[PDB]
């Protein structure tokens, strides 16, 4: 067979960052070369494993987690980096093995008048430990006055809506991001290259 990268890259729907979509890929043959030589990807940055050296070296199972961020926020998808997205929405561990493929999607994910489908978390009381998602939409308490769950003074909505337009700045165009992550366990190497 072949590893099913078609329905994760060319998919028609990408999830927001506060609910980044996770897909477990295993028990297939890897063809990462097509990923590297496509030349349609704006950014393709790989840590731990060299892009030309991952074709032969293989693992047990990979996780492809995809989302949509701003253009200027794609620098934050990297180990040991700060910011709103890298702290409250998607944080990678310092010991990272997978890597990031981000390509512009201004002709798909941006619509004139404001594409408000994509959201990102802005406020929360604690930082994110690596590789997990929080979906809870409870109004957090900014001050010392309890808001009793209802929204009001000193208690803000954690989520904020992206406004994506085709005429935004090149640093604000909606970038579709996929992240590959590899793990080592006692399981045999199911996914390997040709």
């Amino acid at each position, epitope marked *: 067979n072949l590893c099913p990268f078609g329905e994760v890259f060319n998919a028609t729907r990408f999830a927001s960052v506060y609910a980044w979509n996770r897909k477990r890929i295993s028990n297939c043959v890897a063809d990462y070369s097509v990923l590297y030589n496509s030349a349609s990807f704006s950014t393709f940055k790989c840590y731990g494993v060299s892009p030309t050296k991952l074709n032969d070296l293989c693992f047990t199972n990979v996780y492809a987690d995809s989302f949509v961020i701003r253009g200027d926020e794609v620098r934050q998808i990297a180990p040991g980096q700060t910011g709103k997205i890298a702290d409250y929405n998607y944080k990678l561990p310092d010991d990272f093995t997978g890597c990031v493929i981000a390509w512009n999607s201004n002709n798909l994910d941006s619509k*004139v*008048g404001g594409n408000y489908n994509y959201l990102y978390r802005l406020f929360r009381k604690s930082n994110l430990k690596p590789f997990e998602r929080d979906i809870s939409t409870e109004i957090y308490q900014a001050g010392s006055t309890p808001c009793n769950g209802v929204e009001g003074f000193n208690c803000y909505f954690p989520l904020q809506s992206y406004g994506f337009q*085709p*005429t935004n700045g090149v640093g604000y165009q909606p970038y579709r991001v996929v992240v590959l992550s590899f793990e080592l366990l006692h399981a045999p190497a199911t996914v390997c290259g040709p």
Partner: antibody
Framework: QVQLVQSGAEVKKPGESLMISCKAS????????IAWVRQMPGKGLEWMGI????????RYRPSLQGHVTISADKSITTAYLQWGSLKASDTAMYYC???????????????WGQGTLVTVSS | EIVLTQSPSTLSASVGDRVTITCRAS??????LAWYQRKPGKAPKVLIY???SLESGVPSRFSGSGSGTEFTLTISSLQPDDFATYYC????????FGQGTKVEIK
């Protein structure tokens, strides 16, 4: 200096085919959005569509999705507006504007062409 | 869809007078308002962008102020070249213009 020059005014019969051009010079035609704005008599300014040469990305308003067609020819660096079939309500003043792009914004109509009156009558 | 209003629609003063033009928004536009000057039968020219920034080449008499939903255009000293019509165009969501304000001599 950025210069946009359009054609002269047209007077056409309804149902005909009309193509109105706008020539852009003074900048790189392949890296700046150009938008078409229509000002019907008795109404305020109102955009119709945008086109970005280089990506061939053309977007119209929801109301005018299938009535007008925007096109570009980067060899001569002109932007074309064509009607499949002119109607009686298409009489207006048509502008071509080069959008200066600003972050977290819809872009700014910065430089304007001289405009071109189009009149439809029998 | 965002609709904007200008007050007053018509306003006339003499040379050197102080002219204040108010543009009001239906919803919140932050500061994404640009002010244009349009001569009769001529393409409009941008005067203010980001609601407070002067464009290169425009005389410093024009000034922009305000934020949120209340915006103000102020002309420090009216002069013969200032006589034209003005549009306040927002670009936060989709480009939309006001009804315009026409000024003339008194």
């Amino acid at each position: 200096q950025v210069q946009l020059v359009q054609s002269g005014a047209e007077v056409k019969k309804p149902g005909e085919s009309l193509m109105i051009s706008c020539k852009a010079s003074g900048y790189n035609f392949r890296n700046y959005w150009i938008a078409w704005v229509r000002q019907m008599p008795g109404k305020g300014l109102e955009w119709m569509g945008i086109i970005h040469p280089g990506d061939s990305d053309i977007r119209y308003r929801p109301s005018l999705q299938g009535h007008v067609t925007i096109s570009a020819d980067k060899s001569i660096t002109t932007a074309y507006l064509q009607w499949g079939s002119l109607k009686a309500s298409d009489t207006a003043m048509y502008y071509c504007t080069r959008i200066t792009t600003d972050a977290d914004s819809s872009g700014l109509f910065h430089y304007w062409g001289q405009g071109t009156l189009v009149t439809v009558s029998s | 869809e965002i609709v904007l209003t200008q007050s007053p629609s018509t306003l006339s003063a003499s040379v050197g007078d102080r002219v204040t033009i108010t543009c009001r928004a239906s919803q919140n536009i932050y500061t994404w308002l640009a002010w244009y000057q349009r001569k009769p039968g001529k393409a409009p020219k941008v005067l203010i962008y980001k609601a407070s920034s002067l464009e290169s080449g425009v005389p410093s008499r024009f000034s922009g102020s305000g934020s949120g939903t209340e915006f103000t255009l102020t002309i420090s000293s009216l002069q013969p070249d200032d006589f034209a019509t003005y549009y306040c165009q927002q670009y936060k969501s989709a480009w939309s213009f006001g009804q315009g304000t026409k000024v003339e001599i008194k």
